[PDB]
Swiss-Prot record:
Lineage of the species this protein comes from: Eukaryota, Metazoa, Chordata, Craniata, Vertebrata
Protein name: Serine/threonine-protein kinase Chk1
Cross-link (Glycyl lysine isopeptide (Lys-Gly) (interchain with G-Cter in ubiquitin)), chain numbering: K119
Similarity field: Belongs to the protein kinase superfamily. CAMK Ser/Thr protein kinase family. NIM1 subfamily.
Gene: CHEK1
Full protein: residues contained: 8 to 271 of 476
Subcellular location: Nucleus; Chromosome; Cytoplasm; Cytoplasm, Cytoskeleton, Microtubule organizing center, Centrosome
Native organism: Homo sapiens
Length: 258
């Protein structure tokens, strides 16, 4: 029925491949996973999703120990491939992608879902350059019956993880996703990641906490988006800006063209 044409990327459990229909020539993205409690969780979350800034999930087929997850093929590819190394991208394009990222994250948080691994590799683009949050393999429920549950599991990607995840036994889900969006914004505006990890043993992170914004990547960033990044990349998650307040930010609301 299908045929694995090209590899689109690889995760912890399974691989994502470009599948072209043997009859219709319809090209889709298929996540092929071998072997359980996590794929049942992932399928459950994928069926809950319905938003313009979240990848479309078609369905799932099981073949013994093999699990197939059918998803929307994003023709524009990844946000990662739009970032020019050491440069980034034009500020109006970065603003628009950030507005769309916030829209997708507000939606997820609104249904009580935390993504837990936001990065340019899983932010995909459709034919009209609309951003779509993909890869729900680490996603979990942080709110149910209007009651918040604290996270305790270590997961994500070190340059994108919030510092409380490395320090605290339990932490709130929403500030962790806000933090990763901040690193994505830095990547879009500088074409460079600021640190290997947000720990005191990492010089670049110590430099940021000491406000050495005359250093890269910060010196490449204009004063307005840099003021926003100062509010996002705050060590104490209880003092960190929330998405309702990000929506009131000067740069977030700055009219930009071309
Ligand atoms: C594990 C990681 N990844 C794996 C790939 N993955 C997906 C990749 C997809 C990729 C695409 N579309 C394309 O690649 C566009 C460019 C073309 C043009 C058309 O032809 C085909 C290639 N569409 C849908 C996808 C759906 C998903 Cl879910 C996201 C998660 C995250 O961290 C490291 C890895 O990158």
């Amino acid at each position: 029925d299908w045929d694995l044409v090209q590899t689109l990327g690889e995760g912890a459990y399974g691989e994502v491949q470009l599948a072209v229909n043997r009859v219709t020539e319809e090209a889709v993205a298929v996540k092929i996973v071998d072997m359980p409690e996590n794929i049942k969780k992932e399928i459950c979350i994928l069926k809950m999703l319905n938003h313009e800034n979240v990848i479309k999930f078609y369905g799932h087929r099981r073949e013994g120990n093999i699990q197939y997850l059918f998803m929307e093929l994003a023709s524009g590819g990844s946000l990662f491939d739009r970032i020019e190394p050491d440069i980034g991208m034009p500020e109006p394009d970065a603003q628009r992608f950030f507005h769309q990222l916030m829209a997708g994250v507000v939606y997820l948080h609104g249904i009580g879902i935390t993504h837990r691994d936001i990065k340019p590799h899983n932010l995909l683009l459709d034919e009209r350059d609309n951003l779509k949050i993909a890869d729900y393999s680490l996603a979990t429920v942080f709110r149910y019956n209007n009651r918040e549950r604290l996270l305790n599991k270590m997961c994500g990607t070190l340059p994108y993880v919030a510092p409380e995840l490395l320090k605290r036994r339990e932490f709130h889900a929403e500030p962790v996703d806000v933090w990763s969006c901040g690193i994505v914004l830095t990547a879009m505006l500088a074409g460079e990641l600021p640190w290997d990890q947000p720990s005191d043993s990492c010089q670049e992170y110590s430099d940021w906490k000491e406000k050495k914004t005359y250093l890269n990547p910060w010196k490449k960033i204009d004063s307005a988006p840099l003021a926003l990044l100062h509010k996002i990349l705050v060590e104490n998650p209880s003092a960190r800006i929330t998405i309702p307040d990000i929506k009131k930010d000067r740069w977030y609301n700055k009219p930009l063209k071309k």
